[PDB]
Amino acid sequence: DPVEVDMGRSEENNITQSGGTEWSKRDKSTYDPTDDIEAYALNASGVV
Amino acid sequence: SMYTTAQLLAANEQKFKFDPLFLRLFFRESYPFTTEKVYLSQIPGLVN
Numbered sequence: 209d210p211v212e213v214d215m216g217r218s219e220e221n222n223i224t225q226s227g228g229t230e231w232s233k234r235d236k237s238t239y240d241p242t243d244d245i246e247a248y249a250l251n252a253s254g255v256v
Numbered sequence: 257s258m259y260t261t262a263q264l265l266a267a268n269e270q271k272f273k274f275d276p277l278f279l280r281l282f283f284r285e286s287y288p289f290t291t292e293k294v295y296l297s298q299i300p301g302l303v304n
Binding site (some may be wrong): 253 | 270
């Protein structure tokens, strides 16, 4: 029998990039993704 | 009444990031006062 098992993960934890900020449309120079990864990790509940 | 059985595995108390930086660095000392107003003073200190 199909059984659904789930935990409570807030919608901000699963992030999908859309519109701009595609990490593949901006030019490969003059941009550091460290800012984006820090902004993403700001949503965490503990040290990563 | 009910014959079901259940076991508890683990529980968490999620917490939001908070650290008093500005108190810990700048506002270092406390001054309890029993009066009704506090006076803070200055002096010009410009000598020709």
